[PDB]
Amino acid sequence: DPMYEQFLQRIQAVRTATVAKDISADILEARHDYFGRELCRALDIEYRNNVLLDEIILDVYPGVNLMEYNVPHVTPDNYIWTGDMLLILDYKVSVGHDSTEVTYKKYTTLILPVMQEIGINTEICIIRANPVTNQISIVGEQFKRLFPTIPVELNFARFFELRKMLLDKFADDEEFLMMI
Ligand SMILES: [Mn+2]
Ligand SMILES: [Mn+2]
């Protein structure tokens, strides 16, 4: 895959702490976007990765008088419109649940009020892949009802290989460790 060869190239070339730190964040972000692609592929839903709430609202409800509402500036990864319900989706890749809970409460606080004013029935849904075990957790009762089985075949091994190589290269680097 070109993406792996691209990270390998940057790891091969990297010399400085600040450039190393950005490779690390990029790998973690690509792991997340890789899961998002595979997730939507397994579900037969269109793939998206960060859609402004404004554009979600105009997509499902183009005749809304949008100028009457204060739509918070927020970009969930994706959404599904079942013709009756709007499911807000965010992907996660994590061994723990803490990041899931933070996004859940943020979207519940930021998205749900205005969707209720407008009158679109909405549910926040979060799908987390444990990157070690490949196990899929879901929050969102309606999402679980419409997808009782999630036929994903995930492999995150290459993302660990790449990050491990970078962390080995800067094993001593104090400045670098100060940004994990
Ligand atoms: Mn996102
Ligand atoms: Mn996400």
Side-chain angles (χ1 to χ4, degrees), residues 2-4 6-20 22-37 39-43 45-69 71-83 85-100 102-134 136-140 142-144 146-148 150-152 154-157 159-160 162-163 165-171 173-176 179-180:
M3 185 253 297
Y4 177 98
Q6 284 169 247
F7 285 116
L8 186 64
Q9 286 171 49
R10 287 162 61 190
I11 297 172
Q12 293 161 348
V14 58
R15 284 209 335 120
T16 61
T18 73
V19 172
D22 279 319
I23 294 174
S24 178
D26 286 356
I27 288 163
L28 293 160
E29 171 155 17
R31 174 178 84 163
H32 158 277
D33 303 336
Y34 154 81
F35 171 49
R37 275 188 312 267
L39 184 65
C40 300
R41 184 150 40 240
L43 303 186
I45 71 143
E46 178 167 351
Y47 171 72
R48 301 178 188 95
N49 214 333
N50 292 340
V51 192
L52 274 176
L53 199 62
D54 310 71
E55 322 295 336
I56 298 179
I57 290 162
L58 285 183
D59 185 43
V60 316
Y61 191 3
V64 61
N65 198 5
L66 188 62
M67 72 191 41
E68 325 189 62
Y69 305 96
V71 176
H73 160 239
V74 86
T75 63
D77 288 332
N78 209 345
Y79 66 104
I80 301 162
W81 171 249
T82 73
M85 224 195 195
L86 176 72
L87 307 176
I88 306 283
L89 309 184
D90 208 86
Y91 328 126
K92 290 278 164 181
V93 176
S94 188
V95 296
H97 325 274
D98 280 336
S99 73
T100 294
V102 174
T103 294
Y104 193 72
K105 295 182 174 160
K106 190 199 176 210
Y107 287 172
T108 296
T109 302
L110 287 183
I111 292 172
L112 295 195
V114 83
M115 289 327 272
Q116 167 68 30
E117 301 167 324
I118 296 170
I120 296 175
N121 197 8
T122 311
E123 159 181 293
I124 314 292
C125 323
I126 299 183
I127 296 92
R128 176 176 64 94
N130 181 323
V132 178
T133 68
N134 296 324
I136 309 282
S137 309
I138 305 169
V139 186
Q142 253 292 324
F143 187 91
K144 296 199 227 143
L146 298 214
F147 310 98
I150 312 283
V152 288
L154 301 163
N155 175 22
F156 293 99
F159 302 98
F160 291 114
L162 284 163
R163 268 206 101 226
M165 279 184 287
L166 185 64
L167 293 196
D168 288 354
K169 191 174 191 172
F170 292 82
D173 203 335
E174 265 300 288
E175 288 232 80
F176 172 72
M179 308 101 73
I180 321 304

